[PDB]
Design a binder for this molecule. Structure first.
Ligand code: HEM
Ligand code: HEM
Ligand code: HEM
Ligand code: HEM
Lengths: 284, 146, 146
C-alpha cells in the first residue's frame, strides 16, 4: 500500500515535524475531542481540559509511536506489535475512531507545515495513517482467518452450493433497497425486482466469492483482476463493500437456519471483511 | 421518524411475533461474539471467553432482554425517537461512557438475527424498513452525547 | 442547522478571508489526488495522470470554483441547509449519480485546505465549527437520494 515514494514523503514530512512531535500530538487530540466528542467516551479517566498534563503526556506517547512507525515503515506490523496487542485486548477502541484521530493528525500537520504539505505529501500522509490504523486494529478479531474460521466458511459456503447465484441476486436486491445510495453505481441497470440484469450480476458476484473460498489462503492473487477492475475502472467507494457484505450476511442468515450459528456468523463476517480488504487494496 | 405506510406496517407486523426475551439475548450475545471489543463494557458479566460461554451467560441473556425491551417501547413511538430515548441517551454518555458506534453494531446484528429467526419472511423490503428503524434508534440514542 | 452564535460567527469571520476560486480549485484538485477513485466523474476533464497535472487542469479548477461557490452561498443559509440544497441533491442523485460519500470526502479535504491556508488561525474550536458545517452540507446534499 505504501509506495517507496510514499515512504520518502512521510520521512520528509515527519522529519520536518522533528522535536515538535509531542506538542503536535497533543494538539491533534484536542482537535479530535472537540470535533468528535464521542471519542471522549474512551477517556473518562482523564482531565480533558486544555493543556492538561494527561493530554500532553498522552500526545507525546502517540507521537513517539508514530515516530517509531516512520522509522520502521517497511516493518510496521512488527514495530507496533505491542501497541496492536494493547488496543485489541485491553483498550478495545472501536476501529471507526482511528479514522477520526488520523483526520485530526492530518489537520494538525497541515496547520504547522505550510511549505511541506503539498498535494502529493497530503496523499502519502493520509495513506500512511490509514496503514498505521490498519496495523493497530489487525488483531481485534484473532487476526487473519484462523483454521477454525476457514473451516466454518467452507462448511457454510458448501451448503450454499448451487444456490450461490440466487443468493447473490438476493443480496444485491437487499442492498439496493436498504442502502439506496449504492444504486448510483448501476444507472445502466433495470433494478426492478426480478430483473435479469441483477440476477446475472449476482451470479458473477457469487462466482467470485466461490473462487475466494476455494483460494482462501491465496486470495489476493485469485482476486487480482477484480481488484484492478474496481480500483481503476469502476472506482466504487470503499465504504460500499461493507454494505454489500452486510446484505450477503443477512441473505445467508435467512437461508441457513441450522448453519448460521454465532461462531459461523463471526467467521463469515471476518471472511467478507478480508475479501473487501483485498478488493480495495489497489485503490491508492 | 418518517416511514411509508408500507414500511411501518411491515415493521409492526413482524415485531408482534418477536419474543423479546429470546431475540434480545441472541442479539446481545452475537454482538459480543462477532465484535468482541464490545465486551469492554461487560467485564462484570463473568465468562465471555467463547461463543458457547457468551450465548449461555445468564447475565448476557438478562441484559439482552432489558435492551430489546427498551427498543420495543421505541417502536411504539416511531414519530419521536429522540424524545423517547433522551434520558437513556444521557445515561449512556454521562454514566456508561458507551461509544455510540456500538449502537450501530447492535443494529446490524439485530437485523441478522431477525433474518436468521424468520427466514424467507424477512424479505428485502422488510429488511429495508428495519434498517431505517435501527438507524433511527441509534441516532436517537446518540443525540444527547456531548 | 444548529450552531451556537459563537460558532456561526467563527465560521463566517474566517470565510470572509477566503478566495473562493483559489480554495475551490485547491480542494477539488486535492480530492482527486488524495482519493483518486473520485476521478471517475471527470474523465472529460482531460489529463489527470499526475498530481501536478490535476492541480493545473483548468477544467478541475473551474469545477472547484462552481462547487465552492455553491458552498459559499450555502453559508448564508445555515439554518436552512436542507431547503437550500434540495434541488442540487436531486440533481446529484437522479442525473449525476454521485455517491454521497464523495461529499464527505470533499468535506475532509476542505477542512485540511483551510488548515493549510490559515495555519494557527484555524484553531481547534474553529475546526470544530467547520466540522459541523461540512457535515451539515454533506447531509443536506444527500437528503433527497432515493
Ligand atoms: C494513530 C492511532 C493511535 C496510536 C499511534 C495510538 C497509540 C497509543 C499509545 C502509544 C498508547 C500508550 C501505551 C502505553 O504507553 O502504555 C495509547 C493508549 C491509549 N489509546 Fe491509543 N493510539 C491511537 C489511537 C487511539 C484512538 C483512536 C483512541 C480512542 C479514541 C485511543 C485510545 C487510547 C486509550 C484510551 C489509551 C490509554 C491511555 C491511558 O489510560 O494511559 N487510541 N495509544
Ligand atoms: C464482495 C464484493 C464484491 C465482489 C466479489 C464483486 C465482484 C464483481 C464482479 C465479479 C464483477 C464483474 C466483472 C466482469 O465483468 O468480469 C463486478 C462488477 C461490478 N461491480 Fe463489483 N463486486 C463486489 C462489490 C461491489 C460493490 C460494493 C459495488 C458497488 C456498490 C460494486 C459495483 C460493481 C459494478 C458497477 C460493476 C459492473 C457491472 C456491469 O456494468 O456489468 N461491486 N463486481
Ligand atoms: C438498542 C440500543 C440500546 C438500548 C435501547 C439500550 C438500553 C439500555 C437500558 C434500558 C439499560 C438499563 C439502565 C438501568 O437499568 O440502569 C441499559 C444499560 C446498559 N447498556 Fe444500553 N442499550 C442499548 C445499547 C447498548 C449497547 C450496544 C451497549 C454497549 C455495547 C450497551 C451497554 C450498556 C451497559 C454497559 C449498561 C449497564 C449495565 C449494568 O447496569 O451493569 N447498551 N441499556
Ligand atoms: C459541497 C459539495 C458540492 C456542491 C455544493 C456541489 C455543487 C454543484 C453545482 C453547483 C453543480 C452544477 C449543477 C448545474 O449545472 O445545474 C454541480 C455539478 C456537478 N458536480 Fe457537484 N457539488 C458538490 C460536490 C461534488 C462532488 C464531491 C462530486 C464528485 C466527486 C461532484 C460532481 C459533480 C459533477 C460531475 C457535476 C457536473 C459538471 C458538469 O456537468 O459540467 N459534486 N455540483
Amino acid at each position: 500500500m505504501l509506495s517507496p515514494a510514499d515512504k520518502t514523503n512521510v520521512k520528509a514530512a515527519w522529519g520536518k515535524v522533528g522535536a515538535h512531535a509531542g506538542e503536535y500530538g497533543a494538539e491533534a487530540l484536542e482537535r479530535m475531542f472537540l470535533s468528535f466528542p464521542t471519542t471522549k467516551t474512551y477517556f473518562p479517566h482523564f482531565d480533558l481540559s486544555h493543556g492538561s498534563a494527561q493530554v500532553k503526556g498522552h500526545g507525546k506517547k502517540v507521537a513517539d509511536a508514530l515516530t517509531n512507525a516512520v522509522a520502521h515503515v517497511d516493518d510496521m506490523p512488527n514495530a507496533l506489535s505491542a501497541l496492536s496487542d494493547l488496543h485489541a485486548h485491553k483498550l478495545r477502541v472501536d476501529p471507526v475512531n482511528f479514522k477520526l484521530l488520523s483526520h485530526c493528525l492530518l489537520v494538525t500537520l497541515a496547520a504547522h507545515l505550510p511549505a511541506e504539505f503539498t498535494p502529493a505529501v497530503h496523499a502519502s500522509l493520509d495513506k500512511f495513517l490509514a496503514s498505521v490504523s490498519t496495523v493497530l486494529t489487525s488483531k481485534y478479531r484473532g487476526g487473519v482467518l484462523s483454521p477454525a474460521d476457514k473451516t466454518n466458511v467452507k462448511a457454510a459456503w458448501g451448503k450454499v452450493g448451487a444456490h450461490a447465484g440466487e443468493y447473490g441476486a438476493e443480496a444485491l436486491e437487499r442492498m439496493f433497497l436498504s442502502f439506496p445510495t449504492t444504486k448510483t453505481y448501476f444507472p445502466h441497470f433495470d433494478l426492478s425486482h426480478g430483473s435479469a440484469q441483477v440476477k446475472g450480476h449476482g451470479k458473477k458476484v457469487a462466482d467470485a466469492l466461490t473462487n475466494a473460498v476455494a483460494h482462501v489462503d491465496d486470495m489476493p492473487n485469485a482476486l487480482s483482476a477484480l481488484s484492478d477492475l474496481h480500483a481503476h475502472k469502476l472506482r466504487v467507494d470503499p465504504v460500499n463493500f461493507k454494505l454489500l457484505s452486510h446484505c450477503l450476511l443477512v441473505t445467508l442468515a435467512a437461508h441457513l437456519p441450522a448453519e448460521f450459528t454465532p461462531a459461523v456468523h463471526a467467521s463469515l463476517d471476518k471472511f467478507l471483511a478480508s475479501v473487501s480488504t483485498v478488493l480495495t487494496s489497489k485503490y491508492r | 421518524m418518517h416511514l411509508t405506510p408500507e414500511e411501518k406496517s411491515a415493521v409492526t407486523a413482524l415485531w408482534g411475533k418477536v419474543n423479546v426475551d429470546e431475540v434480545g439475548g441472541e442479539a446481545l450475545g452475537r454482538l459480543l461474539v462477532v465484535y468482541p471489543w464490545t465486551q469492554r463494557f461487560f467485564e462484570s458479566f463473568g465468562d465471555l471467553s467463547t461463543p458457547d460461554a457468551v450465548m449461555g451467560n445468564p447475565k448476557v441473556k438478562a441484559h439482552g432482554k432489558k435492551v430489546l425491551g427498551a427498543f420495543s417501547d421505541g417502536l411504539a413511538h416511531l414519530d419521536n425517537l429522540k424524545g423517547t430515548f433522551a434520558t437513556l441517551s444521557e445515561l449512556h454518555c454521562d454514566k456508561l461512557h458507551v461509544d455510540p458506534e456500538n449502537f450501530r453494531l447492535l443494529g446490524k446484528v439485530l437485523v441478522c438475527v431477525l433474518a436468521h429467526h424468520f427466514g424467507k419472511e424477512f424479505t428485502p423490503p422488510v429488511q429495508a424498513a428495519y434498517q431505517k428503524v435501527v438507524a433511527g434508534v441509534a441516532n436517537a440514542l446518540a443525540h444527547k452525547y456531548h
